[PDB]
Amino acid sequence: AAQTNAPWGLARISSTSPGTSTYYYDESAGQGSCVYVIDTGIEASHPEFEGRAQMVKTYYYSSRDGNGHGTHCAGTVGSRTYGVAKKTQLFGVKVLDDNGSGQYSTIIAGMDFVASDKNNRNCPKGVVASLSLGGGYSSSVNSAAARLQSSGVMVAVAAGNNNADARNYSPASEPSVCTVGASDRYDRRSSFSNYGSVLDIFGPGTSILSTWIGGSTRSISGTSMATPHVAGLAAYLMTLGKTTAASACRYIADTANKGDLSNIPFGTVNLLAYNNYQA
């Protein structure tokens, strides 16, 4: 399949080269896979999700995304226009309130929820969790992400937007999950993107056009926005049978575009998420 005039991020993950605008992907498109977007919630009613998105858990008075961030990340995972896995199932876990903040206990409970709730969902191709959140280091938040990963979910997490080593951020510093840094359309590390040995992959992170609340769209930047690319890519790869949840991050890194990003600090992987699709 070929989605012309796609967001640069989608085009980049299906390209060996920057500066293309067409997203190429196997039409299976993550069908039969599931991606939990653990974030501010998902506006499931957004036409871009085609009824494949839905809130499964909130820790606040409403499951509605009153922020837009979770809807934006869900749109990058699996929205029809802005999504990597255009036929994956999207499950919203609202662990962040409508300023996009959340206590670590709430975030941890949301991760533990996904580890169990995937047994309540039909995901024969596999389960992915997109964690476009992060704060200071917390061994309990790291362990929660490791548990989610261990449960048979691909956990993709944002490296953080601190322009620092992601070792001091959670769940970015959890080694078992897939820590995603942010790159821009010119294959440069996003100026805000965290780095360090803990990063496993870079995704498109700067000026990422995706769904927004109010049935709208907008372009925003963050490692939180490279993350749904990798999360959607895993869901896409797992559906193709190319990899499993335990091995998706290692597989994405093996198949990533190598040595093409600039301003990657010494010691940080120079790997850009790549679907390796050959049309």
Say how far apart CA 73 and CA 15 lie, in whole Å: 21
Method: electron diffraction
- Decide: residue 120, CB within 10 A, 0-12 exposed, 13-18 middle, 19+ buried: exposed
CB atoms within 10 A of CB 36: 33
Catalytic, 97? Answer no
Is residue 265 a contact partner of residue 256, using CB atoms and an 8 Å limit? no
Query: Residue 7, annotated ligand binder?
Result: no
Angle formed at CA 81 by CA 78 and CA 84, multiple of 5 degrees: 40
Q: Which of 132, 173, 183, 224 is catalytic?
A: 224
Residue 121 exposure: Cα atoms within 13 Å on the Cβ side: 28
CA 28 from centroid of its chain's CA atoms: 19
Domain spans of the chain, in order of start: 2-272
Say how far apart CA 164 and CA 167 lie, in whole Å: 8
Catalytic, 132? Answer no
Q: Which of 14, 65, 69, 117 is catalytic?
A: 69
List the structure tokens of 128: 């992915």
Catalytic, 150? Answer no
The backbone torsions φ and ψ at residue 178, rounded to the nearest 5 degrees and listed phi first, read -105, 105
35: β partners:
90, 128
Say how far apart CA 135 and CA 161 lie, in whole Å: 10
Fold of 2-272: Rossmann fold (3.40.50)
Q: Which of 134, 146, 210 is nearest to 172 (CA)?
A: 134
Resolution of this structure in Å:
2.0
Phi-psi region of 33 (alpha: psi -120 to 50; beta: other; left: phi over 0): beta
Say how far apart CA 91 and CA 86 lie, in whole Å: 14
Q: Which of 28, 33, 39, 183 is catalytic?
A: 39
Place of tokens 């548990």: 147
Query: Residue 16, annotated ligand binder?
Result: yes
Q: Helix (H, G, I), strand (E, B), or coil: what is residue 7?
A: coil
Q: Which of 241, 238, 199 is nearest to 118 (CA)?
A: 238
Query: Residue 65, annotated ligand binder?
Result: no
Is residue 271 a contact partner of residue 257, using CB atoms and an 8 Å limit? yes
Following DSSP, what letter does each residue of 179-229 receive, concatenated? EEEEE-TTSBB-TT--BSTTEEEEEE-SSEEEEETTTEEEEE-SHHHHHHH
